[PDB]
Amino acid sequence: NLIEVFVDGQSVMVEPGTTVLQACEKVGMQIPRFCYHERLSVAGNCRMCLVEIEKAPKVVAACAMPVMKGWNILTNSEKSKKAREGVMEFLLANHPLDCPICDQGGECDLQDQSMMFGSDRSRFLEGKRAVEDKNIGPLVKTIMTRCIQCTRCIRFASEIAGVDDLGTTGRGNDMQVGTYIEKMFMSELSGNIIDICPVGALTSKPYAFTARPWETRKTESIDVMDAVGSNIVVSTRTGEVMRILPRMHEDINEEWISDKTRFAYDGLKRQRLTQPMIRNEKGLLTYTTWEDALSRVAGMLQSFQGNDVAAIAGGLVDAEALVALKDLLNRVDSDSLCTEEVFPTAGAGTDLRSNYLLNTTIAGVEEADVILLVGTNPRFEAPLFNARIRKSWLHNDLKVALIGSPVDLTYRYDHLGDSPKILQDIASGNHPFSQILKEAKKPMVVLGSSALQRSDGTAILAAVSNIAQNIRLSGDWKVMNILHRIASQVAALDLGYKPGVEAIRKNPPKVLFLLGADGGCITRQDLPKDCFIIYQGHHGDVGAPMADVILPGAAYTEKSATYVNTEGRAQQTKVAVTPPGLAREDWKIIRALSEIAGMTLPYDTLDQVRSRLEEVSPNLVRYDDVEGANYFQQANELSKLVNQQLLADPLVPPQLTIKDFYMTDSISRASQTMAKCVKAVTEGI
C-alpha cells in the first residue's frame, strides 16, 4: 500500500514508485528543474533537482529517484544548496549574454531559478561557445546559442507528436540539438516546443520582439477554431491581442494547443468588418449607420414572414447569438433556421444529445482498449483528440483501426479498406475486427462528422450504430461517439437548429440571415432573384461579398459568449478586447433589430440571455460539466426504421494534408502566418 516518507521532517504517505520530486510536490515544495516535464519522459540530465537524503552521502536526482520507506528528504540542506549553485554556475557559465534581446526575458526559468537557487557572481574568465542557428520552419525561430541541451523538445517531439526528426548531433560540449539536415519541423503541434523550451532557444517567430511578459494582461478564455474547445490564455497589451498561450485543462487540453489555435490570432487584425454596410444605387457596398442598416433589415423582416425566412449559422457563432436569432425568426412564425454543417435527421436526429455527442469523453480515451475511427482524419480535424489517442496508444497499448483512406496519423494503426462496405460487413460479423471488438473490454466507435457530409451520411450513422449495438449485445461505458469539427455545431443542435441546409434548398427563402456563414454552401444562384441577404460577421470572405446588408460583429476574443465542444461541455469565452470601430456584439445586434422591427425580445442583458439559454437547454448554462445520459437504445431503435444503401464511393477525408489543416476557416484565411505556413509546406523552406 502507501509508504511513508519524510520531507524536512514532515511525514507524508505516497504511492509506491513515487519520486522524490512528487513527494516534495505533495508536501508543497517545488524542487528546481530544467529537463523534467510531468507530461514527458524522465531524462535526469540537467542535474538541477539534486536533493540530499538525510543519511545518504551522495545526492540523488529527485526527478528520477523513487522514494524508499523511511527516507527523510532535506530540500533546504547545505549540500542541496551547493549542488544547485554549482549546476546553475555551469549553465550560466556557458550561456550567452542575450537577455535584453531575448523574447524569454521576463518569463525565463533560467533567470528565475538563477535568482532563487543560484549564486549572484561569476568566476568564469574564459570565452563562451557559439552555435550556428537552425531553421525548422516559419513558426519557430531558433537561436541555439541559448539552448541548455535539456532535450525537452526531442522527448516532446517523439512522444507527443510522433515525429522523430529532432535529436542531438555531436558529443561533449559540442553536442547540438537539431535536425542535422535542413528539414523543417512542421506539425499540427509545433508551437508546444516553443512553450516547453525553458530558454529562448525556441521562440515564437510571429511574436518575436513585440512585447514583454510583464506588460501583457492575461484573459482566460477558450479556443474557437474547432470542436475540441481548448482552454487558452489571451495576452493583450493596450487593447491589442499580443499572443495566445495554452491553459491547463487535464480533460481537454492537457497543456497543449494546436498550431492553428496558437498562430491564427493575427487573422483578427486583417479583413475586418468595422462599420455597417449597405448597397447604394450603383450596387456597391458603402458605409452607413446602425440605425439605417437596422431600419432596412427591420423593414424587410416586417414585409416577409413564414417559411420565406432562413438563417444560416456558420462555424464561429455563439449560443447567445444563436438563441437570439432563433427567437427573432420564431417571432415571425419562420423556421428556416439551419447550420452550415450536415447531420442525419433520420430517426432520433437531434432529439437526443447522445446521438450526436462524443459520449466517451476526451479523457475517456485513456481507458479504452480498442478504438475504431470511421471516415475521419483526427490529426487535422481535432489535433488534441489525436494527441490523446496517441498518448493512449503509447501508454496503454491501445489498438487503433481506421476505416477508409490511409491518412498519416502519428502512430501505427490497422487500416481497413476505403469503402463503407467493410463498415457494414463488420456489423454482420464477417470481418475479424468484429471478433476484436467483441473480445475488447473497452471499445470505442468514433465516426467523424466530416463523413456525414456526403449523401449517404444517414446510412453511415445507421451502420456504425449497428456495430455499437452488436458490441453492446455481447456497464456505464459508452461506445458510440461522434467527432465534430465545428464549434457552433453542438450549440446549434442543442438549441434546435436543423442540420444541413437542405430545408433552405427545398424552400428557397426571400430573406436570408448569414450569421457568420462563410462556407459558401448557399449562393445567389441557389437563391431566388432579388433575395435579401443580411450577413452578420467579423470577417468579410464570402457572405459579406454576397450580402445586401453587412452587420459588423465581435470575435470570440472580443465578446463574452458560450460555446459547446464536441463532447457536450459548455465553456464561456471572456472579453479580452473590444470590437473595432462600430462593430457590436451579435446578440445585442439581434435584440436591437428585433426592437426596431417591433418584436422586442424579452432579454436586455447577458444574464437574461443566459436565462433564456437555460430555459431552452440547461446544459448550455451548466459550465464545465460533461456528465449526461446515454439514450443509445432509443437512438438505435429509431435509426433502424428507415434503410438506405451505402454508396460505393471511398471515404476520403476532406483534410489530407497539413496545408488543408492550415487553411480551414475565415480567421485562418485572413491570417498571414497561416499563409506563410501553407507556402512553406507546399513550396518548401
Binding site: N330, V332, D351, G496, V616, N619, A629, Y631, Q634, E637
Partner: protein, 85 residues
C-alpha cells in the same frame, strides 16, 4: 395553436424525475414514430423540477411542470399537448 416544438427537461438523478425518466426509457420511441417531423427535444436539468415546454406558432410557449409525475401522467400530458387540449 399550431404546435411547433416540444422540450422535456428532466434531471437524470433526482427522485422527482423518476417518472419522466421511465417515459423516456420505454415510451419515447413509440411517441417519436407517430410524430416523425415533430421536434421533441429531450434535455437534462440539474436541480429544478422537470418541465415540459411547448412552443407554438409565432414564438408562443407554455411550460407544464412534471414533478413527481408517473409514466402514465406524462403520457396523458403529452397527448393533451399534441391534440391541442
Amino acid at each position: 395553436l399550431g404546435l411547433r416544438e416540444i422540450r422535456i427537461h428532466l434531471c437524470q438523478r433526482s427522485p422527482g424525475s423518476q417518472g419522466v425518466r421511465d417515459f423516456i426509457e420505454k415510451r419515447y420511441v413509440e411517441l417519436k414514430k407517430a410524430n416523425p417531423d415533430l421536434p421533441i427535444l429531450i434535455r437534462e436539468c440539474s436541480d429544478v423540477q422537470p418541465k415540459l415546454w411547448a412552443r407554438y406558432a409565432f414564438g408562443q410557449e407554455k411550460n407544464v411542470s412534471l414533478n413527481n409525475f408517473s409514466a402514465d401522467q406524462v403520457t396523458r400530458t403529452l397527448e393533451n399537448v399534441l391534440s391541442g387540449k
